[PDB]
Design a binder for this molecule. Structure first.
Ligand SMILES: CC(=O)N1c2ccc(C3=CCNCC3)cc2N(Cc2ccccc2CO)C[C@@H]1C1CC1
Length: 113
């Protein structure tokens, strides 16, 4: 019933959509934390100080870590920003990030208030 609750319901709906099969073709790189060691990315944690991914956002939502929509959105955008910072702009993953961020931003804009 509360404003913060309702807005976080909207955030949770968005999160569910981002993780859904509908968007899997471009969402998959963002499902789990970047495993720098697995991918041979030995500079990743020197360049990306605050890693983020959708599983972490999900855990934080489930743990009631996010106190408002703004805090949730900051993590989702951090995830995209990290991708844009680390990868060259012509990399496949950047195109995927842009597409998933489009999904995010347009639905986030429909926030109840
Ligand atoms: C999230 C993120 O920035 N990354 C990213 C994150 C996760 C994963 C994987 C997830 C599941 N297992 C396979 C790899 C792969 C990437 N890639 C590689 C990747 C992405 C998409 C298409 C093709 C490739 C191959 O060049 C890039 C980048 C990394 C350079 C930071």
């Amino acid at each position: 019933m509360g404003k913060l609750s309702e807005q976080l319901k909207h955030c949770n709906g968005i999160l569910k959509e981002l993780l859904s099969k509908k968007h899997a073709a471009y969402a998959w790189p963002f499902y789990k934390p970047v495993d720098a060691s697995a991918l041979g990315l030995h500079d990743y944690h020197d360049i990306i100080k605050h890693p983020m991914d959708l599983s972490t956002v999900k855990r934080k939502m489930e743990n009631r870590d996010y106190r408002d929509a703004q805090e949730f959105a900051a993590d989702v955008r951090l995830m995209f920003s990290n991708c844009y910072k680390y990868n060259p702009p012509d990399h496949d993953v950047v195109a995927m990030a842009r597409k998933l961020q489009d999904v995010f931003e347009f639905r986030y804009a429909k926030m109840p208030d």
